[PDB]
Ligand binder design. Structure first.
Ligand SMILES: Nc1ccn([C@@H]2O[C@H](COP(=O)(O)OP(=O)(O)OP(=O)(O)O)[C@@H](O)[C@H]2O)c(=O)n1
Ligand SMILES: Nc1ccn([C@@H]2O[C@H](COP(=O)(O)OP(=O)(O)OP(=O)(O)O)[C@@H](O)[C@H]2O)c(=O)n1
Ligand SMILES: Nc1ccn([C@@H]2O[C@H](COP(=O)(O)OP(=O)(O)OP(=O)(O)O)[C@@H](O)[C@H]2O)c(=O)n1
Ligand SMILES: Nc1ccn([C@@H]2O[C@H](COP(=O)(O)OP(=O)(O)OP(=O)(O)O)[C@@H](O)[C@H]2O)c(=O)n1
Ligand SMILES: O=c1ccn([C@@H]2O[C@H](COP(=O)(O)O)[C@@H](O)[C@H]2O)c(=O)[nH]1
Ligand SMILES: O=c1ccn([C@@H]2O[C@H](COP(=O)(O)O)[C@@H](O)[C@H]2O)c(=O)[nH]1
Ligand SMILES: O=c1ccn([C@@H]2O[C@H](COP(=O)(O)O)[C@@H](O)[C@H]2O)c(=O)[nH]1
Ligand SMILES: O=c1ccn([C@@H]2O[C@H](COP(=O)(O)O)[C@@H](O)[C@H]2O)c(=O)[nH]1
Lengths: 215, 215, 215, 215
């Protein structure tokens, strides 16, 4: 499943993120704000149950209960993902969090890269209950999808109920590379940009997330 | 314009609010959470302009800018509205806030009320720039719409660019009474309940907002 | 007990509040920020129990547990108090909240007022468990103390374990009027100003809280 | 300068952190809450200036202005530091943030370690304006101080106005190793534990921060 959340407000925020004239502080704040929104969006795709509920007026009426809100595990790739994850956590108060610090190797090639090398420097995750937990992996940018793939390479092992991916911008290349390998993934993104350059950056994109957030 | 935000997450929260077994603390927390969501929702209906922006990659791309995010005035009816307004404020960081403390007189009549008598005990509002400001009036419950009408009775005077009304539950009666008197209002609500009782309470509803929040 | 929290940060914020050139938005934001801080401050005066706990290293060590953090009731006077209460609530996550909407009558007299007439327009409070609950009443300004006294006039009825009063600025007159009538009250304030004018305003003070927040 | 913030509330939170029976969610939440508090505490040690301002009552009074609140750079060591940094950021709204991902090598030795080997896997920091910026480095635990030292090894290069270190628990050994090498550092901690074990863990301590937060 591919979800492109292009509502006014998310595009508005995305514009600010794209704007090279946005300082790191506001860059991060916007990233958190988006995380919260994308969380809301994911919420409505979550599996839920119909229930009945009684009101103070002594009458019963039917309602909804997204019990799955207790079966969420957010994976923090770290670095630029932090502010985004922060937003997601605010969205899912009862979510557990694990971290899989992965970093692709920045390299300048002759052609547009198809894959980068990614390494997991730190891993500490909660226990992902197979068939029960909804796992959400966040990463502001998905270029060659190499980073996401490395993380997924082992989130899938746990066989979660669902696996959501959340990013601000994903390249057409990355999106296809991921969904063709794991068609069951719910991929959420604010925008899908057309191309990558020789260094592996999304165009137009918004520059290097890490630098835009901490530089 | 009538907007009934019945997405899973808002219904989920509404269910918790309806549930007579929800303590005041969680009642309020849920009210704030909804406020933020409804804010997000309103955001996407806001008037916006298309712009262009240059990304760090030295390329220009078009984007959105909801400049109107600077022309928002939230009116706090006070009492139960507080938690809801709190949520709205978190949604509109740059919003100004005024307060019009209005309270209908709780009375027990023979038939289902069509109007209650509301009085403004405190009024202090910013400068509502005609044709420019988007005014948002919040009230968890709209039963006879008498309360909303009293407030509107003078928000309209300022002739804002737009006037949004936000509630958790509104009675079919209230919604009709408001939109037929001010067809231009953007009325947002999570649910529209069918009837009112002799005391003027929404059925099923969720009881007395004030009591559910501070009792 | 009188507590004047005059640490750099609280004075810094108080300065912003005093400055007449501070818009309502930042006025309110600062009020919330102070509420948090004052909450923290009150926390450390709270009654607590020494306990023992076992760390992951399989060793036991003594610790503290402010169980009273579950026995807090914050009373919202409404209007300008809202932002301050918001800050307090963020400080006491598990606090219940009641509201006693009281408003003194603004009048211009020949001399400096010694009392104003305050009326309770709305009252809805949780159950204040005598000898157990720590009640916190917030009001940004305490001039003739007439407002605080009216509220206390019945918070005392419930015979709480403790009663804390929180304000940004209190007049020397008010502070003495309160603590001499209820010596057991824990009165917290960022600053105590010297005099009141003929209309009953604190000098230097910071103007009318309501107007500075919603005007 | 050594600052041991042992007020009721910080000890209360520290107790929860120490308790091995605290799940990762509440572990993290407490870490953020402390970050805020410790931020508040640091705030009051900040350099400030005395100013004057005119209140709405047309009178001038002196006030404080901690201008340095604009000259703060928080360094995120990543991993367990994240929640702590999150708290600090909430305390310093205008703070810039850089990250120096450093990780000591966990090893089991015969005796109590005196140093571990730490490596910097990722570094991206803002402009640390010499003599002007107040740098705050956060790390929940300081055992052999090897991690802090590695980070400081190059924060010092920038010659900031001040350098604050923030941790929940620091070993007597670490505290001594740091302050004797950089006597000018403002070291803030909630508690100083007596010893380390053969693996380099603080006793009593609270276990492995990373595991307590993401395990
Ligand atoms: N120097 C700063 C200041 C803030 N932040 C991030 O921005 C968030 C909140 O910004 P603000 O708009 O002041 O808070 P609200 O969104 O209005 O409320 P909340 O923090 O609960 O979302 C912080 O939590 C943090 O994640 C940051 O990265 N760097
Ligand atoms: N599953 C979760 C839920 C929350 N958090 C952390 O705990 C913080 C807030 O917890 P809550 O008490 O719900 O928010 P408040 O402290 O009351 O307000 P604020 O978030 O602005 O501090 C989040 O921002 C986040 O840093 C987390 O790590 N994991
Ligand atoms: N006893 C309490 C505690 C909280 N609240 C309300 O609930 C809000 C936040 O609850 P929490 O989930 O701890 O904060 P987050 O939603 O996670 O982050 P934020 O406060 O910025 O929304 C408070 O701001 C306040 O409006 C309340 O009315 N009464
Ligand atoms: N137009 C606005 C915007 C904000 N606020 C108040 O200021 C608070 C938060 O301001 P911000 O600094 O953006 O949030 P943080 O303090 O950083 O995090 P938190 O909201 O949980 O305290 C809101 O919750 C609200 O009480 C307000 O009264 N009017
Ligand atoms: O334009 C880009 C492309 C990638 N990245 C970063 O590089 C990593 C590589 O993603 P990928 O190319 O492996 O998909 C991601 O963590 C992301 O933060 C950017 O900051 N900007
Ligand atoms: O079922 C109801 C109906 C109304 N009200 C409260 O009574 C007021 C009256 O609204 P109205 O009947 O004038 O529309 C509103 O402020 C609202 O909070 C409730 O709490 N519950
Ligand atoms: O300088 C002042 C004095 C009072 N008040 C407001 O007037 C009320 C009266 O307090 P008191 O004079 O009864 O103590 C309080 O709610 C307070 O908000 C102000 O806003 N500014
Ligand atoms: O009891 C301990 C000791 C250390 N650490 C972690 O190990 C690192 C090493 O600190 P140090 O021993 O180099 O001072 C720190 O990042 C810290 O998070 C813990 O989690 N618990």
């Amino acid at each position: 499943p591919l979800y492109v959340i292009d509502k006014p407000i998310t595009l508005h925020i995305l514009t600010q993120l794209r704007d090279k004239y946005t300082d790191q502080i506001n860059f991060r704040k916007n990233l958190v704000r988006l995380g919260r929104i994308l969380g809301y969006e994911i919420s409505n795709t979550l599996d839920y149950e119909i229930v009945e509920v009684e009101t103070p007026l002594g009458v019963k009426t039917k309602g909804v209960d997204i019990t799955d809100l207790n079966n969420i595990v957010i994976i923090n790739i770290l670095r630029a993902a932090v502010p985004l994850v922060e937003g997601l956590l605010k969205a899912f108060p009862k979510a557990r969090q694990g971290v899989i610090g992965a970093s692709r190797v920045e390299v300048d090639g002759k052609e547009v890269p198809k894959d980068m090398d990614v390494y997991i420097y730190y891993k500490k995750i909660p226990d992902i209950r197979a068939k029960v937990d909804n796992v959400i992996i966040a990463d502001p940018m998905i270029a060659t999808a190499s980073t996401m793939l490395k993380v997924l390479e082992e989130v899938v092992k746990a066989n979660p109920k669902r696996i959501y991916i959340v990013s601000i911008i994903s390249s057409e290349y990355g999106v296809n590379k991921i969904l063709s390998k794991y068609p069951f993934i719910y991929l959420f993104t604010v925008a899908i940009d057309p191309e990558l350059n020789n260094k592996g950056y999304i165009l137009p994109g918004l520059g290097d997330a890490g630098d835009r957030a901490f530089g």
